[PDB]
Amino acid sequence: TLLRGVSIIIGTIIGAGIFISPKGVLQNTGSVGMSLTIWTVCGVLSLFGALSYAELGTTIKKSGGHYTYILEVFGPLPAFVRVWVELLIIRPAATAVISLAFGRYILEPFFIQCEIPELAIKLITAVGITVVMVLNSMSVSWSARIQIFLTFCKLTAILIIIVPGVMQLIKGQTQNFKDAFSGRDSSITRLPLAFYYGMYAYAGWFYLNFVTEEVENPEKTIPLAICISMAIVTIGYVLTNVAYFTTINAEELLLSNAVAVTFSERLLGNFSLAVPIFVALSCFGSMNGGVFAVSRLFYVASREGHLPEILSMIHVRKHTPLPAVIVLHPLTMIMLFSGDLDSLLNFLSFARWLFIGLAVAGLIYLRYKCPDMHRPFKVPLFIPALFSFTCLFMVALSLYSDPFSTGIGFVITLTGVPAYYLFIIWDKKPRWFRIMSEKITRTLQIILEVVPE
Amino acid sequence: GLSKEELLKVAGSPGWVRTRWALLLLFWLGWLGMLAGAVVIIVRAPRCRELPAQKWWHTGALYRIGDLQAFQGHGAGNLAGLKGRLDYLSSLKVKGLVLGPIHKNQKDDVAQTDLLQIDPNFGSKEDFDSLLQSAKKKSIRVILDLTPNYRGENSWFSTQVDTVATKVKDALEFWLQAGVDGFQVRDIENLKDASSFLAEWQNITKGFSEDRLLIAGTNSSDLQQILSLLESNKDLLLTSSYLSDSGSTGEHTKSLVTQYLNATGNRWCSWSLSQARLLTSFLPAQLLRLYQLMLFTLPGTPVFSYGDEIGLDAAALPGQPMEAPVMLWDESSFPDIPGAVSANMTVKGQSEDPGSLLSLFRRLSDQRSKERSLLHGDFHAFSAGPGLFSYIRHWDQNERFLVVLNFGDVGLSAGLQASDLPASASLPAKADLLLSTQPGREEGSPLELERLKLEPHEGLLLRFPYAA
Ligand SMILES: CCCCCCCCCCCCCCCCCC(=O)OC[C@H](COP(=O)([O-])O)OC(=O)CCCCCCCCCCCCCCCCC
Ligand SMILES: CCCCCCCCCCCCCCCCCC(=O)OC[C@H](COP(=O)([O-])O)OC(=O)CCCCCCCCCCCCCCCCC
Ligand SMILES: CCOc1ccccc1-n1c([C@H](C)N2CCN(C(=O)COc3ccc(Cl)cc3)CC2)nc2ccccc2c1=O
Ligand SMILES: *[C@@H]1O[C@H](CO)[C@@H](O[C@@H]2O[C@H](CO)[C@@H](O)[C@H](O)[C@H]2NC(C)=O)[C@H](O)[C@H]1NC(C)=O
Ligand SMILES: *[C@@H]1O[C@H](CO)[C@@H](O[C@@H]2O[C@H](CO)[C@@H](O)[C@H](O)[C@H]2NC(C)=O)[C@H](O)[C@H]1NC(C)=O
Ligand SMILES: *[C@@H]1O[C@H](CO)[C@@H](O[C@@H]2O[C@H](CO)[C@@H](O)[C@H](O)[C@H]2NC(C)=O)[C@H](O)[C@H]1NC(C)=O
Ligand SMILES: *[C@@H]1O[C@H](CO)[C@@H](O[C@@H]2O[C@H](CO)[C@@H](O)[C@H](O)[C@H]2NC(C)=O)[C@H](O)[C@H]1NC(C)=O
């Protein structure tokens, strides 16, 4: 129904991006004002893209995912390179960013106003990831009721910042926004970097997987729920940046590594160790949304020709996907012990917004060059055109921004095509190869005890 | 791929179950090894020292406004016009405000004059309340001077001493109820039994609250006359003329500052050149940038006079009182002898030049008030070239600062052989540069600390981070 729809969207779309983002948004812009315009532009851009995915996924009506939206509007290897670049770029670098924030925010009651070694962080993040994966490889029934509690934890983590940020606003009228649009004299070649940091704050809608006859009166319920429960997030996310700027100047925020602890350290009350616990629980709630929605993606991709059938096999008792965990873990650990947040956001965001822009352009290409295949609801022609235009322009301009961290994503998606004809368009090039790879699947299927059920 | 029933009869074998129990225990031992390594890298971490919980007059500079009439202009010299300049004062980022004696005083009769009633030529009690509320809004503290005979020669009523002592006791209890943040008394060498009265006044000032100040001001240049005033007091800020006698060579000023810090025992002090004069009355026109770099980077509170940010000269202008020169806000401040001012002789003409003197004041007054190793860092000078003065500020692990000054008109190199500093903040090989007093160097260009060649009257503000 309606209220459970806005509840599930408000639960999947907020998280801990509001603690990672506003330092990288301010750094790649100038003053407070350009930052707040970026934080409200990204909200309506995410609204437009969410409306486009909802209008696109109820016109194809297949078994979910925008892997099956690039396929059936492009067919071959455009949809192969998406599922290649997924498990090689996007998902390891997505887990290795929320984990790096989580590990940072629990070492704060032990390093009060002092500096932390990085190797103390990384070996705590690499404990939290494995505890997440061991929890996922056991029963799913505990793994969802834990998630519900972490959803209420991330709501309270937003709320205990948004309440004392307005009690400082209507009291004395404390203002340091004065000169709002006066920046640090230029930001034009690193504008899309801020686009990469704002959109990460709203991430989550592109795993929602809308299927038509499950919500009551579905001709009008889905776009109404999306447009209400996206503008609610845009309100709650701009007032939180107002709450951050109401107590911190624009120069303390660039030298700080955790803005939610310097908000609390000057807004005390003798339990200001609450917020590095609740920001940690909000960072854990996004980590726990891990191997799931990768598993059903592996199930759909394994059903045709891609991603060999050992993946999307299932443990016999306690029917949980183990080889997705096995293939995800030594990749996110490699990317975790490598470079920092500012490299990983760029390295994932390049490929991620490139493929979402391709899919929402394919929505238009299917709308005009196939005027059949009826629509339960439609959007105006300017909405996905504008979203795809901004996506592809920011991704293209991001190559003139730091190219030794995003150009590796470009060379990986261009080695996607020398990995396509070698593994899809061919027929058993050695016999030294198939008989070798059969024993591989046999041995590790025997070790993991996994069946395709 | 193997199906269900062909799998359970192979993966139930001996061997196949023992290898997976072995791999499971190997994975768990790697996990607990990572946990124990993270714990031992947390514990083997160096401690971190505790911040001193400073007061407000530790955090910035004080700005003495002696004559209020000549601060804005004649006819506009009331307390109401002072409210339009507090934005300019916050642009300077001064933390306090030492207002002049605004009380009523006629002349050498004590019975008519009174430290309780405001003179009507300055404003009202309601306007003083509005000043205090607007200053508390901008977070600028107001310190009220209370010298009794501030219109005359002998400021302390040299006939008797009892009534002038009792009336200050009534004065400190009166104004603190209104909400002032401190007090200042001047020329206390003309006050008999001074260290006994100062301890009583300091008691009353600390007895209202703990965040209140008392500033005493002498004219004595002698060190032993200064330490005798600091026998029963620790919280007293004492401004004297201790630095204004000489300083033509760097060895003399180096010996002066280090001897003062050795004698008082590294306590909180106040670095100033006078009690009511400007910087230009004791220095030539070229040394103002060097002394403004020095006075902001020394361990204590710097106290400046009004106009010292723009190089306000009185001897380079016509007929004026040498103790209370007129302030040059614009190109039309100085009314008579027209055309005497210039573009560089005023505030707004210096509020746009990047290589100006007021820009150096604003670049130093925020680095003093924001950075942590200049707030309460340590102090260690060392030997250097014959004519230089070089020192280092460092707090715990924060950004180390290095200041190198040239008190002479010669071309000298630095030659920094440290060899005696603590092992925490010893000299690095290469360090950055924040600013210089002269044009001709770019900001942010790291140097190596060997061929540091100095042009005459140059000062530097190198910095380097904590490493080993
Ligand atoms: C710097 C960025 C951060 C770090 C990133 C590091 C990336 C390293 C490269 C990893 C490449 C992994 C590619 C696996 C792609 C599998 C694609 C696929 O669908 O294979 C299908 C094929 C047939 O299966 P089936 O349909 O018959 O069941 O089934 C198979 O092909 C079975 C073989 C599966 C393994 C494929 C190995 C490919 C080797 C790629 C060369 C690079 C590594 C070489 C290592 C050599 C060491 C000996
Ligand atoms: C510099 C040093 C480098 C060292 C290697 C670094 C890479 C580490 C890779 C770690 C992979 C992720 C490990 C996740 C472990 C699964 C969690 C788990 O305990 O599963 C429970 C499962 C069922 O238990 P039970 O019901 O039998 O008691 O219990 C089981 O199913 C037992 C079997 C699974 C054991 C998992 C150990 C690793 C599996 C190896 C599979 C084949 C490896 C192929 C190459 C993969 C790496 C490139
Ligand atoms: C966090 C997102 O998932 C949830 C959302 C709400 C409640 C629970 C979950 N949840 C779910 C549930 C059973 N779900 C499955 C996937 N789900 C969609 O893919 C959106 O389906 C839509 C339905 C209606 C609309 Cl209008 C749009 C999309 C929605 C429901 N399994 C989990 C499994 C492992 C860990 C966490 C969760 C988990 O948290
Ligand atoms: C004021 O300083 C005096 C000594 O410098 C201290 O003790 C006070 O001494 C006076 C007599 O000179 C007494 O009248 C007070 O009652 C004393 N204060 C007490 C006993 O608390 C003391 O350090 C300061 N006084 C206060 C109240 O802080
Ligand atoms: C500090 O100011 C006084 C006032 O001009 C200087 O002169 C002293 O004045 C008092 C009475 O006004 C006399 O009792 C002293 O004997 C005077 N001192 C001397 C040395 O003549 C005093 O000289 C000034 N101090 C300095 C260092 O300039
Ligand atoms: C000035 O600093 C020096 C060290 O730089 C110290 O001099 C010491 O003075 C005491 C008492 O006269 C002697 O017992 C020590 O042997 C001296 N040490 C050295 C190294 O000379 C002291 O801190 C200060 N001197 C005075 C007289 O206050
Ligand atoms: C303001 O700028 C003028 C122009 O540079 C200064 O006038 C020069 O002053 C120097 C030394 O004071 C003399 O050597 C030059 O001969 C002067 N040139 C001219 C054209 O006047 C003036 O002194 C500056 N004002 C201040 C206060 O520094």
Author numbering:
A (entry chain B): 45 to 497
B (entry chain A): 164 to 631
The authors write:
The small-molecule compound erastin induces ferroptosis via inhibiting the cystine-glutamate antiporter system xc–, which consists of two subunits, namely the light chain xCT and the heavy chain 4F2hc (encoded by the SLC7A11 and SLC3A2 genes, respectively). The complex formed by xCT and 4F2hc has also been suggested as a possible therapeutic target for cancer, as it is overexpressed in a wide variety of cancer types; moreover, inhibiting xCT impairs cystine uptake, causing an accumulation of ROS and suppressing tumor growth. Erastin functions by inhibiting the import of cystine, thereby depleting intracellular glutathione (GSH), which serves as a necessary cofactor for the enzyme glutathione peroxidase 4 (GPX4) in eliminating lipid peroxides.
